Amino acid sequence: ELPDWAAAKEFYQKYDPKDVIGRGVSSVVRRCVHRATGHEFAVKIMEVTAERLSPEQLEEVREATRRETHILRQVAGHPHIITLIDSYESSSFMFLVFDLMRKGELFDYLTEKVALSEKETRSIMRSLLEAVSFLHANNIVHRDLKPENILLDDNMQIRLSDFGFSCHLEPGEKLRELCGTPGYLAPEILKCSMDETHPGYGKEVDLWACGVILFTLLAGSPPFWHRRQILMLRMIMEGQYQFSSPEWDDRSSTVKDLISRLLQVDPEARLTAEQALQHPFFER
Amino acid sequence: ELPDWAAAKEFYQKYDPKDVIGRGVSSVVRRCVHRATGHEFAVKIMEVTAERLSPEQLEEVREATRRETHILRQVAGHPHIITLIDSYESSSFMFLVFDLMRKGELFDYLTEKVALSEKETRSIMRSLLEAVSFLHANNIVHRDLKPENILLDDNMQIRLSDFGFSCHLEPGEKLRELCGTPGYLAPEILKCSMDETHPGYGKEVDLWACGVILFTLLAGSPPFWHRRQILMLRMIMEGQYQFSSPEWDDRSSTVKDLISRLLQVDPEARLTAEQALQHPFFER
Amino acid sequence: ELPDWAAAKEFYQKYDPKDVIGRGVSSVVRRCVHRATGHEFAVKIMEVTASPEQLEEVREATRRETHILRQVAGHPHIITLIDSYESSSFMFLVFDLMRKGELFDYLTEKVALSEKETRSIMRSLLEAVSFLHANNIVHRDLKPENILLDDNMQIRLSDFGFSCHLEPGEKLRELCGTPGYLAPEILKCSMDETHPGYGKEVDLWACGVILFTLLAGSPPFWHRRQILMLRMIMEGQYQFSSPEWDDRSSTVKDLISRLLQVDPEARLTAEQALQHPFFER
Amino acid sequence: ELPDWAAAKEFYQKYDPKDVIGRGVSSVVRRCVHRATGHEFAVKIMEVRLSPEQLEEVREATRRETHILRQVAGHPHIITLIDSYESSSFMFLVFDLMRKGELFDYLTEKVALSEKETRSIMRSLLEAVSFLHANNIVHRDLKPENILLDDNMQIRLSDFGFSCHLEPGEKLRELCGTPGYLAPEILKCSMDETHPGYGKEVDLWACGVILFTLLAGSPPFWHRRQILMLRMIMEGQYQFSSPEWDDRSSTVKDLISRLLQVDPEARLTAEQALQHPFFER
Ligand SMILES: CCN(CC)CCNC(=O)c1c(C)[nH]c(/C=C2\C(=O)Nc3ccc(F)cc32)c1C
Ligand SMILES: CCN(CC)CCNC(=O)c1c(C)[nH]c(/C=C2\C(=O)Nc3ccc(F)cc32)c1C
Ligand SMILES: CCN(CC)CCNC(=O)c1c(C)[nH]c(/C=C2\C(=O)Nc3ccc(F)cc32)c1C
Ligand SMILES: CCN(CC)CCNC(=O)c1c(C)[nH]c(/C=C2\C(=O)Nc3ccc(F)cc32)c1C
């Protein structure tokens, strides 16, 4: 609601933006320094009018970013969720100040390490499921859990980010919007988006994505993939995945049981985040 | 079958390969000249061993190409189906000599003209449906009908090509395999690729594709499309398409009736190729 | 100059930023609206934060560019610098909004242009080049990417990043510009420190390359290896290949030839090129 | 030479072609199996619109290449031409199969290499270069794309398409090789006909560029604009940038500086480079 000159003035007067650590379609993520203290943060600068869109499409983008910042303020404080430290909002742009996560995305870490150990995977998954359990208890569904949306610090501590697809979900109520990354989508989202008669989806979709993340961290490859995206959709919907002999050889049966219980096609038969956390995998 | 040196010797002795007119994963299509006469053809050189594959997958490729060449020999002679003039078959490769179709793919013609007239569309559709009627009478289902698989000569005469997905279908027998271009897929192919209890599909899938082709030739755009492929599938299964006012304005009610009778979700209620050919759109 | 917050405040208070219409290495070009009048413009935002000595080199170079732009502001076929805002990190340059974008993208869409359309573009281009030269400015980066179009298909020369002043009789030495558009004397000079240098004639060789490219839809000196392209330039080896140069007049081929003249002394000036029988109407 | 059916028959009778492991403009590289022994090789299949004169140029050049390859066949760090079959439209060249592919693709995967692994690659690359030079051959296209690796991480120098024999005392002038790897003297004499020419020292400048690139993961002379890259080369302007050169010894920095020496007389020979304390142990 601030004029553009005010949001820009207030941000640049209080913060010193530094090197670019990430880029998006209508945004850039930069390291920044709080001038008065010398303390470091990360700033996401969203350019709301950077894309050519109809006035209706533009108000959709504005309403969605409002939905996101509201959710970010609700969950600010949780140790394994990104903290919105400060915000400068105007009609044309949004300056969102967050925690600086110095080891970047979990995705880039996985690329470097190829595949992670069960010890390091346990630590990441526990933190992730704790964050998901908190969101769920507060009736928030993330709707885009993936290694690209999980950030790391120098102590290898994770913080869940990118709440652009997140929304509130009243207990009992169901969603239908197709959003998220195809490889991480639960069967009920696909069934739902292809068949209008399908009842819809809930918070269980996050736990299917957790199952996909868990598999990918250990295997170094996703459980469902194909050259042709349409053939990937039946493997997801039929829950067709395998613990292939070369990479899944020395992996415990305990983690395979956890993946099996998270990668459950029936959302009613699927583990909740609280259930997943009391799984023996996390009992060390 | 021939040793590799014999297939290569026999082909290169009789034919002079020229310019590349098409590319594939493990194949190239080139214009070629019959050395003794100077007459021109097109040769598809299939490189069976060009991709690194398991011994089982490699025998799948070999069996697949045998299925295709067998079908091509059965249908050779039909005026609106590509003619396999000659073949040199060895373990490692396949040299398939065909008619040279000098105006290339119908798809590229449609791109150039943007949208075709009902007069030119009638001529193409009549020839297409005659070819489809012939295939089905011989218990063959094409399974990938689209403007990219329809070739044109200088006289604007068509020839159906690309029989890589074709198969024999004994009458009354049903298929389940998902293969073929998503935009051209019938609802029953999708429905049974997500509901295992669904009985499967038959030769009617080629006629849905004919309906999609007919719409696209006239509109210059497909009846089902979305940025997200999964939302396009929902439109196909519900048979949700429209004759949009700017491009469908001066188009006859007769062709819109034909399209409606081809883009019929129920395969039993959908026109057969013989039925489509008796429709008043094909009146001379 | 000013603190970062001040240049940003001054720009965003006067202008409303809209859609991105272009991107560069250290810049973005956006459509913008002047809040008080409602008039549309284009703003180039240069981010000089994405050594302190090298950063002042970049600042000094952008000052050289804006100075030249202010001198030429007013010409109907040259981009107009409307406004500018400077800080340590940023540079906000407000220009005319050219709604049909780059001539390069237009050429991609049309594949090749007609002599009639090419005549209109070339006349405007050579008039702008003649003006630049009369004011002792050498553009040094003339190419279809640096020529902008409005809705009336009217041309404006832009991207004065390599431009500089040139007192008559004096010569230049710096190797700059796009390789495909470089005159032979620039390549010759870049090596031999005893070589006398180059002048405003390098702009007219680039005009010759532009003229060829508009008609052919491809450049006269091209290959996969850039080093072999340099040999072609220096020997002035171009051909009017039979498929695309078939329907072309001998009059325009005579013009191309007289612009693509290796000897800068024998090469047509902008005023000479404008008196060519190709521009008689 | 032979009709097309004969070159094809002779090749496919002796070798069983497998998967495509590489592609070029007018060629494909495939793994192949020698039918009688079951041993694996790599075959480069070269295929042919050009004038009859230009087509005989492409033929004569490939004959120059195969002649050089037969002279060098036997060296442990040079690619071995096992066999060759030629026709009007094809050339089948059978070589050693280097299972870890191009050093370039290995560098892409690893991003940057260790000094331990670079010393091992650079020793064998200099030994191959020293051998070529002792036999009066200049490679003229040394780069990571032309260095092949086996499973033991052992190298073999390949792609002799620009190679030529050079009589001692005599000099070359042809501009060829990859721009980023070109020595300053190649650029100086391409433009100036009075410049004396270049010799085998150009391969050692390329070795210096390879050494830099293996350690940095990026080349020493690079720029968004190709024409600014040439200026960088000729002035020998490169830097050991703080993020990627942080954990690199001064010893390897020294050898790079002694190989990336603008004066060819002051530049290290292959035998001299092999006596540097970087290879001592
Ligand atoms: C140059 C080396 N790297 C290789 C891939 C650069 C990539 N990126 C990095 O290292 C990186 C670093 C150090 N932090 C982040 C991102 C965020 C951060 O820290 N707080 C946030 C709050 C919100 C948000 F939306 C993103 C971030 C990245 C992507
Ligand atoms: C000129 C460059 N282009 C791309 C490589 C050309 C566009 N393509 C063209 O013109 C074209 C022409 C002139 N014929 C074909 C294809 C076939 C043909 O004729 N007989 C066949 C038999 C089997 C088959 F599977 C394809 C063809 C194309 C794609
Ligand atoms: C970025 C997305 N699109 C891809 C084709 C947009 C295409 N781009 C377009 O249409 C386009 C338009 C409509 N204007 C411009 C550029 C400028 C302009 O107008 N005044 C200037 C003054 C100075 C300058 F240095 C650039 C411009 C482009 C590139
Ligand atoms: C499809 C391409 N891929 C890119 C990442 C595969 C990577 N590359 C690979 O697998 C590869 C392998 C395993 N060998 C080679 C090349 C040659 C080889 O072995 N003997 C030769 C002799 C001469 C020559 F001129 C090339 C080769 C490649 C390109």
mmCIF file of N, CA and C and ligand atoms in Angstrom, chain B residues 20-23 29 42 82 98-102 104-105 151 162, ligand 2:
data_model
loop_
_atom_site.group_PDB
_atom_site.id
_atom_site.type_symbol
_atom_site.label_atom_id
_atom_site.label_comp_id
_atom_site.label_asym_id
_atom_site.label_seq_id
_atom_site.Cartn_x
_atom_site.Cartn_y
_atom_site.Cartn_z
ATOM 1 N N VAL B 20 19.277 -34.587 -46.213
ATOM 2 C CA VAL B 20 18.473 -34.957 -45.043
ATOM 3 C C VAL B 20 17.164 -34.152 -45.098
ATOM 4 N N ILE B 21 16.005 -34.833 -45.121
ATOM 5 C CA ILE B 21 14.686 -34.185 -45.167
ATOM 6 C C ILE B 21 13.925 -34.406 -43.845
ATOM 7 N N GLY B 22 14.486 -35.228 -42.947
ATOM 8 C CA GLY B 22 13.938 -35.532 -41.627
ATOM 9 C C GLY B 22 14.899 -36.281 -40.718
ATOM 10 N N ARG B 23 14.789 -36.036 -39.403
ATOM 11 C CA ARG B 23 15.607 -36.626 -38.327
ATOM 12 C C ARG B 23 14.714 -37.306 -37.279
ATOM 13 N N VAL B 29 15.916 -39.440 -42.323
ATOM 14 C CA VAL B 29 15.206 -39.582 -43.597
ATOM 15 C C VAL B 29 15.925 -38.714 -44.597
ATOM 16 N N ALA B 42 12.835 -41.553 -51.059
ATOM 17 C CA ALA B 42 13.174 -41.167 -49.692
ATOM 18 C C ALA B 42 13.609 -42.427 -48.997
ATOM 19 N N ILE B 82 1.872 -44.313 -47.436
ATOM 20 C CA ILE B 82 3.269 -44.325 -47.903
ATOM 21 C C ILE B 82 3.641 -45.753 -48.425
ATOM 22 N N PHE B 98 11.166 -45.425 -49.656
ATOM 23 C CA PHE B 98 9.775 -45.034 -49.822
ATOM 24 C C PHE B 98 9.567 -44.060 -50.955
ATOM 25 N N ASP B 99 8.290 -43.656 -51.139
ATOM 26 C CA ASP B 99 7.930 -42.553 -52.017
ATOM 27 C C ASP B 99 8.539 -41.275 -51.472
ATOM 28 N N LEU B 100 9.022 -40.408 -52.351
ATOM 29 C CA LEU B 100 9.498 -39.085 -51.950
ATOM 30 C C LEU B 100 8.289 -38.146 -52.005
ATOM 31 N N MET B 101 7.907 -37.531 -50.884
ATOM 32 C CA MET B 101 6.751 -36.625 -50.814
ATOM 33 C C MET B 101 7.306 -35.233 -50.720
ATOM 34 N N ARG B 102 7.423 -34.588 -51.888
ATOM 35 C CA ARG B 102 8.104 -33.328 -52.132
ATOM 36 C C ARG B 102 7.545 -32.086 -51.409
ATOM 37 N N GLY B 104 6.466 -32.265 -48.308
ATOM 38 C CA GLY B 104 6.717 -32.637 -46.920
ATOM 39 C C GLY B 104 5.495 -32.936 -46.089
ATOM 40 N N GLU B 105 5.550 -32.541 -44.808
ATOM 41 C CA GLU B 105 4.488 -32.783 -43.841
ATOM 42 C C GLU B 105 3.354 -31.783 -43.959
ATOM 43 N N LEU B 151 1.869 -36.893 -45.250
ATOM 44 C CA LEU B 151 2.801 -36.308 -46.211
ATOM 45 C C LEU B 151 2.092 -35.866 -47.480
ATOM 46 N N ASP B 162 4.445 -42.986 -40.870
ATOM 47 C CA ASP B 162 4.847 -43.173 -39.458
ATOM 48 C C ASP B 162 3.985 -44.203 -38.719
HETATM 49 C C1 LIG E 2 14.949 -28.980 -46.372
HETATM 50 C C2 LIG E 2 15.091 -29.219 -44.789
HETATM 51 N N1 LIG E 2 13.970 -29.829 -43.875
HETATM 52 C C3 LIG E 2 14.266 -30.732 -42.525
HETATM 53 C C4 LIG E 2 15.393 -31.760 -42.248
HETATM 54 C C5 LIG E 2 12.870 -30.294 -44.804
HETATM 55 C C6 LIG E 2 11.419 -30.325 -44.356
HETATM 56 N N2 LIG E 2 10.981 -31.576 -44.768
HETATM 57 C C7 LIG E 2 10.594 -31.876 -46.008
HETATM 58 O O1 LIG E 2 10.637 -31.061 -46.882
HETATM 59 C C8 LIG E 2 10.201 -33.259 -46.188
HETATM 60 C C9 LIG E 2 10.076 -33.849 -47.520
HETATM 61 C C10 LIG E 2 10.263 -33.236 -48.864
HETATM 62 N N3 LIG E 2 9.764 -35.112 -47.346
HETATM 63 C C11 LIG E 2 9.681 -35.425 -46.047
HETATM 64 C C12 LIG E 2 9.444 -36.855 -45.451
HETATM 65 C C13 LIG E 2 9.274 -38.056 -46.147
HETATM 66 C C14 LIG E 2 9.220 -38.371 -47.552
HETATM 67 O O2 LIG E 2 9.267 -37.562 -48.410
HETATM 68 N N4 LIG E 2 9.043 -39.728 -47.815
HETATM 69 C C15 LIG E 2 8.991 -40.323 -46.515
HETATM 70 C C16 LIG E 2 8.821 -41.768 -46.059
HETATM 71 C C17 LIG E 2 8.856 -42.046 -44.736
HETATM 72 C C18 LIG E 2 8.986 -40.955 -43.745
HETATM 73 F F1 LIG E 2 8.970 -41.266 -42.532
HETATM 74 C C19 LIG E 2 9.128 -39.605 -44.110
HETATM 75 C C20 LIG E 2 9.131 -39.294 -45.500
HETATM 76 C C21 LIG E 2 9.899 -34.254 -45.253
HETATM 77 C C22 LIG E 2 9.853 -34.326 -43.719
#
